[PDB]
Ligand binder design. Sequence first.
Ligand SMILES: Nc1ncnc2c1ncn2[C@@H]1O[C@H](COP(=O)(O)OP(=O)(O)OP(=O)(O)O)[C@@H](O)[C@H]1O
Ligand SMILES: Nc1ncnc2c1ncn2[C@@H]1O[C@H](COP(=O)(O)OP(=O)(O)OP(=O)(O)O)[C@@H](O)[C@H]1O
Ligand SMILES: [Mg+2]
Ligand SMILES: [Mg+2]
Ligand SMILES: [Zn+2]
Lengths: 562, 564
Amino acid sequence: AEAGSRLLAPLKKPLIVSGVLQALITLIELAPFVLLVELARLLLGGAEAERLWTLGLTAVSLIGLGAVLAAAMTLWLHRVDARFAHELRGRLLTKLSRLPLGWFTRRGSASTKQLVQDDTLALHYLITHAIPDAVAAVVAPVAVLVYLFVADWRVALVLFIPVLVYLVLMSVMTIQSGSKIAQAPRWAERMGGEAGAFLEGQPVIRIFGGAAASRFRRRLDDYIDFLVSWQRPFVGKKTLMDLVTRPATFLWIILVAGVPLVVTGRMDPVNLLPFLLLGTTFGARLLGIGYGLSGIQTGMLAARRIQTVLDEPELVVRDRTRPGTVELDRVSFEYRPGVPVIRDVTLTLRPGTVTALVGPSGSGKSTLAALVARFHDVTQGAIRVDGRDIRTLTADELYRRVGFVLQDAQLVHGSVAENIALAEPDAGLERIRTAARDAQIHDRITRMPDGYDSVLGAGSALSGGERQRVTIARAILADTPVLVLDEATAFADPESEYLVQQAINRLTRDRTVLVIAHRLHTITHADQIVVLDDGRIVEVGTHDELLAAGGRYRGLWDSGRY
Amino acid sequence: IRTLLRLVPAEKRGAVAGYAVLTLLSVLLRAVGAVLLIPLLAALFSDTPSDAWLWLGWLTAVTLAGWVTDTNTARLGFDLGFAVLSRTQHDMADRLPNVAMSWFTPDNTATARQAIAATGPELAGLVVNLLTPLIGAALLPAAIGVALLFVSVPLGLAALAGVAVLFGALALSGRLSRAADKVAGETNSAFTERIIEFARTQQALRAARRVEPARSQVGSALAAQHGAGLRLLTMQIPGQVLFSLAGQVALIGFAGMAVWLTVRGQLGVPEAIALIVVLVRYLEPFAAIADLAPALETTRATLNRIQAVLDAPTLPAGRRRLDRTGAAPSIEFDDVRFSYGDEVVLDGVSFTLRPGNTTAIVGPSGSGKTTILSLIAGLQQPASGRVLLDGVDVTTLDPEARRAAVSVVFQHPYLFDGTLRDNVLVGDPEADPDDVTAAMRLARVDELLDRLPDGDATVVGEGGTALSGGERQRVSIARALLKPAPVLLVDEATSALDNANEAAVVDALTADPRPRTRVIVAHRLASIRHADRVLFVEAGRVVEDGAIDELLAAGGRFAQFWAQ
Ligand SMILES: Nc1ncnc2c1ncn2[C@@H]1O[C@H](COP(=O)(O)OP(=O)(O)OP(=O)(O)O)[C@@H](O)[C@H]1O
Ligand SMILES: Nc1ncnc2c1ncn2[C@@H]1O[C@H](COP(=O)(O)OP(=O)(O)OP(=O)(O)O)[C@@H](O)[C@H]1O
Ligand SMILES: [Mg+2]
Ligand SMILES: [Mg+2]
Ligand SMILES: [Zn+2]
């Protein structure tokens, strides 16, 4: 696979050496049994004792040398694999930092977890074991069989019977499970998505249907049906391979072919000693790669998935190359091709002005905020911050110029100090208390058991309106020249909403602010009110001008009183 | 292993007895097959090789019987492995919706996610891949030692002497690596929860510039994951060294006794040569145990997570049912107390809702409004006090009857990844298309179907992520209205909807033709239109309540609330 060779290119020389070392090791692991054959041949021959001690002690030590070399070789090769995955996992996280945000929405958090963690873990056998097992499974059966075929071709041919049966069993097993191996990672992604939604959507499941009617229960039953149909023939062929390749199976068929040749005057019992001692050894090497073809197939698929994401388009920072000003020029955008959401929007945001973005639900006002953040590139037109295109700005410059609150008060697993200081983690507690105080959340944080160290993990510590005021505190602490407030203060009560708004006006007096609100009574003070209907600017003006116009804004304002 | 037998179904305990008998029989047959070479080669090397036929016949019978035993052991191991898989996974799927909502901490959610994530082929093939070779590899040296007693007593004792060394290495190898393996799993489990957080919180992280691995929390969890992973590879070195010493010590003990007997005439040369083959067969399980022992410790963590969910505290329930399935019940609290941990939310709430009426709940943010609705729907339960539906305590009510009594609109609309229609149908999957259309038309979701290109087949993201904030809110409202439950709970349905859509939705919450007792947790004075009663809740009790005109006339906290 091209996508697999490109990804595993850094491990070219480590993997070549692991193949060369295992050829030497497995030869060393077979040397004791060649010497034990000579020890056995000389015990029958009545040789001198000191010669037997030489063969006996050398053979026992060579068993120790092979065990030491084998253990050391897998240790180094396991650490090469461990260091590659850290390098690879960090590469993926670096890549995902830059991808357009439509990648995350169309995929989900369960597929990202499978990508960064499970798919990199799926490469373990391919990197650490596939080449060691392949070289062992080649050189050891080949070295043993060539040694034994010279010893006796009659018994040596009979050793091919379990070998050929093993090759047929793994080949048939490989073609059968090839389709299921490819289908397997999709099912894990789906079950991770269902399991994640099952855990996250627990209030919905508890009230609507419970366990019985849940989408997770059905997919759980379907997944096990896939596993049983996948694993029953796979495990069934696995055991026949183990039975075929076992030492007891080789030893029995050596004796079935051997004893009649010895009872009759066709073979000496001395010449059976190579078969009894070495004939039973190479079966375990054969089973190593036979059990391992699935690891290679899954690893090669995972490497293909990983390199596909690392080849993704990236929202590049191009080298094309008034303060606080943001200008939208002929901006258009499509979440999906052929589905307009923004249509030729032209707008300018100037310092010391409050711009209110209003309109019907689903008109694209949150999309415009995301476009200024450059979560997605505009399909047409341009968005320029302080005279420079954001496609030319780097991420640090872009997000130091403009700050965001996003209508979906996402909180990370950490303390409220870590959440409020998300923008500037090096900020001090004195600043955090100041930012939290302005966001009207400091009093709540004081009442917590651990105070500002209290953790904000899953299902903890805050109501919906309290989460939003934490994210406002984050934006205050960032202290960027431009600010965007996507539906902020939506869950805030009127008494608390006034205090937060008054603080925002105080802090952003001389700064560019883009407020987005459905509650039109809260944006009467805006310098300009921009009405976005069906992804296009239908009217622009002050509150009185838009009311007198008798257009969409007057309709929304009149309908606000019910 | 003690933990796995706990998870075995009771209906399969007949198969475990058969599996155990065949598993012991597998070891006995393999060991007899190995020691049957000593008389066979002794007869083969003798002056009368024709005597070798008797021992080859017994070897053929023992080996053929071994194939039948180990094939059946594989069928039962597969059946037992998947029976435990489907039993535990279905039990966890059944149990988790009944587990107390306080149990879903970030640590336990990781445990439940990993426990559910164990559904793959690795856990299913547990009995085939781990227990069968572990039991065989552990008992095979002991069975060869017992089998060798019929050839020579001290030789069998010497082979049993090395068995004790094998178990000594087996116990110590797990003991040395148990401290490091626990950290490796814990740091690897934290890394899972940060990738999910990383993907789920990209906008907030990207704006905050906490997205690059040098500055991100997932990058820090990756650095700790790597350090704990490399530490595990190092602290596992003593175990592999200790198994190698055990194998070498057993080799010296076995070979030392064989040579000692041979020079003293108690053991012929062919018997001694035959024991070299039995020595190799005796020593192969020493290496097999070494390869399987690291996998044994990861299984113990896997089964512990599964048992952690199965031991999770399910919520109290009964077997009562409402007097009528669809009639509007009266909702009342009788001095309800509630607290999240030590932080109190409610401190003696007592109200009564008339059946079939619509009442409103308003108050400051963080007051307890969402907690009140959760207690009515049974998501939470009081620390003390009681909630009664139609005069029947919900804590003593059937989970089916309790679940069917309430439909809710949540403050934060969560939609499952799927089509827009599938999320509406969750309210009542058995409803006919006429009923589903009525629910969508009431919730103004019909307008979405015109604007959206795929209509009701629009693919909703994780949550309602692939929909606007106001679009997913109306899909949630259609879901709640479709359900025929006689109690409707509404929580900030106005938050994400524009003025035109808000007014239609608010009118639809009461224009719904079913008779329901409605509770409206609202944000605006206009949002509580058509409300028969209003409850003002502040600091965990209903400080004030009454009609809208009554409270405005009194100029109480209700009037001060809208004055900002
Ligand atoms: N999971 C939780 N763990 C701990 N405390 C919580 C949790 N959820 C809410 N709280 C706290 O419980 C109290 C009431 O919260 P609740 O969600 O019931 O309020 P609310 O009136 O619905 O608020 P809002 O208008 O902000 O949604 C507040 O102190 C809130 O911080
Ligand atoms: N990730 C997405 N993928 C596809 N379509 C999307 C996505 N996010 C939003 N949309 C659609 O784009 C249009 C506008 O979305 P957006 O979130 O910008 O709306 P909005 O005006 O902010 O909404 P509201 O006022 O309800 O919060 C709607 O059709 C919405 O369904
Ligand atoms: Mg929006
Ligand atoms: Mg709430
Ligand atoms: Zn490995």
